[PDB]
Structures are given as structure tokens and as C-alpha cells.
């Protein structure tokens, strides 16, 4: 019940940055049961500062950790792409043993827009009875977008399934998939789809459709 | 290497019951404190219990309590967590660790054990293609895709051309709708050498023991 409170909870660096967040505690602890892990997306958390200031081994010497009572730091001295990752505060104080919210660290990189591509559905799952249109948002940057779907001038809210991808390792952009299912019938009866994302790479919204 | 190994991935239905393990190696259970903690999909982490396997005394978060039970074998070196009257909220990560077994060193965390509860039932994946349809004026690279669609449990494997085209593919996380999952992937090529050079899209759900290869045209 000792609530931790990090900060910020995504926060983006430029390669060479320092950087800094913060763990906050609704009660005051040691801080010799004050923890740092890192987390990777696929893997088990990490040991990477313990006891509030002490690195866990192997851990970098740019990163460091500070605090007591009920205030709390990790900071890199300069970012380095692989520091890209979750970091969660724990406190081993008393029980129930808990973790803050976590602070999840990006890679800043050039702005970049969505390369966008819609697709009708398939003959196939036409043929069950289906139809799906599909929508790829690939490798922009920043991670905010807005994705709208129209239908014969009207948005389309209900049925439509987004999903997005980690930050890419190559180039730190991000992608995003959107589809829209409907019944075989409900598609039929329309003619026009389009898939309009709006970021900030461009005032305008970028649009792609198909007829039929 | 000191390490905790915990069993299998778990695929149980609501209402059921499941107990996972955690096995050390390296140093006596005994000899330190073992704990249990789950990670809800795409999210924080929670502490659920505790246990000192010297004298079977236990701690549990309040909110666990009558749901979760820990013990501990030190004969096996293992410890175990027991979760009854599972429920869509159970689903996730549960990974043991324990407090440092020894001076110089950190603590350990096993690899973790998916939970999935649910009662949907085996259904492998309708795998549909994404080709472009209007004439397609994207100059030299083309996008293709393919709708991985209505499959239980997780997860599928998706290649494109049996692995051979890795560079310029998003296959995005699976997404639950209606208790079944949906997935896509996205393929970009030169356009100078598609449809020439056929672009297959490899879809393996390894629960219903199915592979479908859909070629784009
Ligand atoms: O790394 C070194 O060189 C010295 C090791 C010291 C050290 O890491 N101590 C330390 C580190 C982490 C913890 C937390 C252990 N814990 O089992 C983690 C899971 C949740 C319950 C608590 C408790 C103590």
C-alpha cells in the first residue's frame, strides 16, 4: 500500500541526452529497499539499481540513482540507444511490496510521416461472409496518430481494431495497423472506403481509399 | 549459473484451477526468500506473495488473498504458486524470484509462465491476402499484407517467402476480439520485382497444428 508514483510515464531522448525520472512514495521508506528495474518487451524485469544509488552488475556507469524518504531518481548521464526500455522502481519496505506505474524511455528520432496503404477485403473472406479493409500507418514518428475511417461520407467508428508496434530497432519509428470488419453484406452496399490519418508530420490529413 | 526455471505456459479454462513452479538451482531456497509476482498484459507489475521456505511462513498482497496460496519444497528446491477460480483477469505473466542468495550479487527472476484463462476453444486462423487494388501508383516500393483472422489460442507465426523476406515486414500484435485473436502483417518490396517475384505470406498456429501459405496476386 506504500504507492509509488514515476514520472513521466513515456518520456522520449535524443541519442547523447541526459536523462532523468523520478519515483515518488505515499509513505516514506529505506532507502536500502528502494529498487530499479529495467524491462525489455519478451523478457523478465532486471535488476538495475539497488538500494537506491548502487548499480546491479553489468549495468552501465552512466546511470545512476539518488534519494531517500519518499523521493526517488534514476538518471543516465548520456543515452545510449539499448536504454531504450521500462524502468519500474520497487520498494521492498513492508507489504505489501509494491512497484511504481513504470517509466517507459523512447528514442527520440527526426519527425517522420506514415507511409499509408489500404486494402479491400479478400475474395476469400468474401466467400465466408466477411469483409475486412485494412489499413498499414508504416514507420512515422512521433507514436501520436489519429486514424479515421469513412464509409459513403460517414465515420465509422464501431468495428474497427487497431494495433500498434514497438518502436522500431532499426529506425525508431513506429507503425500501425487498422482494420475494419464488417458482414459481406454491409460492404456490398457501400462503395467508398477510405482510411484518413492525421500526424504531425502534416496540417492536411493523409488519404487513401479504393471503390466498390 | 544460479538461475530459476518455472514450468510450462498454461492455456486453462474459467473457474479452473492451475499451479505453477519455480525451480532453483544454484543455491538453497531455504536459504533466502522466494516471491511471486504478475504481470498483467501490457502492463505494471504486482507482488502477490511471499514465502520463507525455512519455515513455510508466507505474506500475501490482501487482494490476492483466497485466491492465490504459495509453499515451498525445499527437498525440490522449488516453490509454488496456486491460483483458484481463475478468471480473464488472472491472465498473465507470473514470474518467481528470489530475495539475493548471496553477497556480491542481485537477485533472481525466472523466465515467467504465461497464464492465459479463457474458455474459447482451439480455432486456427483464417489467413487472408492484402493486395493493392486501385491501379497502384506507389513508384518503387509496393506494400503488400496479409489478415491473420478468428484464431485460439496464441500464438501464430508469420513469415513472408518461408523467412526469406525479414527486412521492410510489421506484423503487428494480435489484437482479442470476441474471445478469438486477429493479427496482420505488412511486407514492403521493390515494385520492380512483384508480382515477378511471388510474395507468400506463411501463416503456423502451432495449437491447431495448422500452416496456410496464401500467395498475394
Ligand atoms: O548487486 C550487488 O552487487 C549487490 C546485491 C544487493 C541487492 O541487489 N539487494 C536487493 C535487490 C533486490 C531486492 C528485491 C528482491 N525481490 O525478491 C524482488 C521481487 C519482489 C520482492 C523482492 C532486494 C535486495
Known amino acids: 500500500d506504500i504507492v509509488l508514483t514515476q514520472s513521466p510515464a513515456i518520456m522520449s531522448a535524443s541519442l547523447g541526452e541526459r536523462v532523468t525520472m523520478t519515483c515518488t512514495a505515499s509513505?516514506?521508506?529505506?532507502?536500502?529497499?528502494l529498487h530499479w528495474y529495467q524491462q525489455k518487451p519478451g523478457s523478465s524485469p532486471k535488476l538495475w539499481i539497488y538500494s537506491t544509488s548502487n548499480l546491479a552488475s553489468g549495468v552501465p556507469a552512466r546511470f545512476s540513482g539518488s534519494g531517500s524518504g519518499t523521493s526517488y531518481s534514476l538518471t543516465i548521464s548520456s543515452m545510449e540507444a539499448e536504454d531504450a526500455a521500462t524502468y519500474y522502481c520497487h520498494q521492498y519496505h513492508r507489504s505489501p511490496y509494491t512497484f511504481g506505474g513504470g517509466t517507459k524511455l523512447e528514442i527520440k528520432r527526426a519527425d517522420a510521416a506514415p507511409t499509408v496503404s489500404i486494402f479491400p477485403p479478400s475474395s476469400e473472406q468474401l466467400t465466408s461472409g466477411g469483409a475486412s479493409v485494412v489499413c498499414f500507418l508504416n514507420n512515422f514518428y512521433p507514436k501520436d496518430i489519429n486514424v479515421k475511417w469513412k464509409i459513403d461520407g460517414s465515420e465509422r467508428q464501431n468495428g474497427v481494431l487497431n494495433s500498434w508496434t514497438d518502436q522500431d530497432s532499426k529506425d525508431s519509428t513506429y507503425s500501425m495497423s487498422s482494420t475494419l470488419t464488417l458482414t459481406k453484406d454491409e460492404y456490398e452496399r457501400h462503395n467508398s472506403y477510405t482510411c484518413e490519418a492525421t500526424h504531425k508530420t502534416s496540417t492536411s490529413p493523409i488519404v487513401k481509399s479504393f471503390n466498390r | 549459473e544460479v538461475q530459476l526455471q518455472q514450468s510450462g505456459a498454461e492455456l486453462v479454462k474459467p473457474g479452473a484451477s492451475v499451479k505453477l513452479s519455480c525451480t532453483a538451482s544454484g543455491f538453497n531456497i531455504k536459504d533466502t526468500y522466494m516471491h511471486w509476482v504478475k504481470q498483467k498484459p501490457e502492463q505494471g507489475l504486482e507482488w502477490i506473495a511471499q514465502?520463507?521456505?525455512?519455515?513455510?511462513?508466507?505474506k500475501y498482497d490482501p487482494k490476492f488473498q483466497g485466491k492465490a496460496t504459495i509453499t515451498a519444497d525445499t527437498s525440490s528446491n522449488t516453490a509454488y504458486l496456486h491460483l483458484s477460480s481463475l478468471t480473464s483477469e488472472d491472465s498473465a505473466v507470473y514470474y518467481c524470484?528470489?530475495?539475493?542468495?548471496?553477497?556480491?550479487?542481485?537477485?533472481?527472476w525466472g523466465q515467467g509462465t504465461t497464464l492465459t484463462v479463457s474458455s474459447a476453444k482451439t480455432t486456427p486462423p483464417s489467413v487472408y491476402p492484402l493486395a493493392p487494388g486501385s491501379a497502384a501508383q506507389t513508384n518503387s516500393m509496393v506494400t503488400l499484407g496479409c489478415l491473420v483472422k478468428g484464431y485460439f489460442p496464441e500464438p501464430v507465426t508469420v513469415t513472408w517467402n518461408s523467412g526469406s523476406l525479414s527486412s521492410g515486414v510489421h506484423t503487428f500484435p494480435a489484437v482479442l476480439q470476441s474471445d478469438l485473436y486477429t493479427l496482420s502483417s505488412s511486407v514492403t518490396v521493390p515494385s520492380s520485382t512483384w508480382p515477378s517475384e511471388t510474395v507468400t505470406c506463411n501463416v503456423a498456429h502451432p495449437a491447431s497444428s495448422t500452416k496456410v501459405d496464401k500467395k498475394i496476386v
Open positions: 509513505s516514506s521508506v529505506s532507502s536500502s529497499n
Open positions: 524470484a528470489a530475495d539475493p542468495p548471496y553477497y556480491g550479487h542481485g537477485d533472481y
Open positions: 514465502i520463507d521456505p525455512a519455515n513455510g511462513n508466507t
